[PDB]
Design a protein around this ligand. Structure first.
Ligand SMILES: OC[C@H]1O[C@H](O[C@@H]2[C@H](O)[C@@H](O)O[C@H](CO)[C@H]2O)[C@@H](O)[C@@H](O)[C@@H]1O
Ligand SMILES: OC[C@H]1O[C@H](O[C@@H]2[C@H](O)[C@@H](O)O[C@H](CO)[C@H]2O)[C@@H](O)[C@@H](O)[C@@H]1O
Lengths: 110, 110
């Protein structure tokens, strides 16, 4: 999967991936990093600032990293209209937050 | 991959997938269908209306299916602000168009 929809989280050790070289991972050392064939090309630069951290995209568009103590250690500060948003690791290697909802099939949640 | 970012297209026979059971495919018979473990649960209902068809998400948020003759055979008619949008097959099985851009790492296009 290469997307994370609000208000869900990407937990410790989990990643968004776009084969065969792109991996955006919420690391166990709290750093949120994008690797291109093993080389880090973007990151929140929060390594060592915690453990058991998670990445959460909120229903207002704000992206945040919480540590084990459930505290904020990094955020995009993009507080907009209450709706639904999505974070996407794209095939062009860009990582983007899109929203609000424009249209939906309604085939889910199911 | 389970997303399509504007202004790109999903060409004939190609799909967005969220393992292990969700498959959203632009079929060779021009129908755009979402299958859950082989069972169709949503579709544009455009089968038989063309061949060599493609699904395109525009930079204004409109989602369209063009036939081989490059004509419109189905669309969401969601014409909004000029920016960038994304179509996503979610793990909760919903298919959603999100936009405009809220934030981006700028790690792409690369
Ligand atoms: O509409 C797109 C939206 O659908 C699902 O969210 C639900 C809808 O917003 C609506 O049915 O209200 C529900 C809460 O009562 C809400 O969960 C999800 O698939 C969501 O991700 C999607 O953006
Ligand atoms: O900003 C998010 C956006 O980035 C990339 O699109 C580019 C930007 O809009 C900006 O750099 O202008 C470019 C055209 O001059 C445009 O391509 C893509 O990654 C896009 O999908 C993403 O939404």
């Amino acid at each position: 999967v290469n997307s994370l929809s609000s208000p869900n989280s990407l937990f410790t050790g989990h990643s968004l991936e776009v084969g065969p070289s792109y991996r955006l991972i919420m690391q166990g050392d709290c750093n949120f990093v994008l690797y291109d064939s093993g080389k880090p090309v973007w990151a929140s630069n929060t390594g060592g600032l915690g453990s058991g951290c998670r990445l959460t995209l909120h229903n207002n568009g704000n992206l945040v990293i919480y540590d084990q103590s459930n505290r904020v250690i990094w955020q995009t500060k993009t507080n907009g209209k209450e709706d639904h948003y999505v974070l996407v690791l794209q095939q062009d290697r860009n990582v983007v937050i899109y929203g609000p909802v424009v249209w939906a099939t309604g085939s889910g949640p199911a």
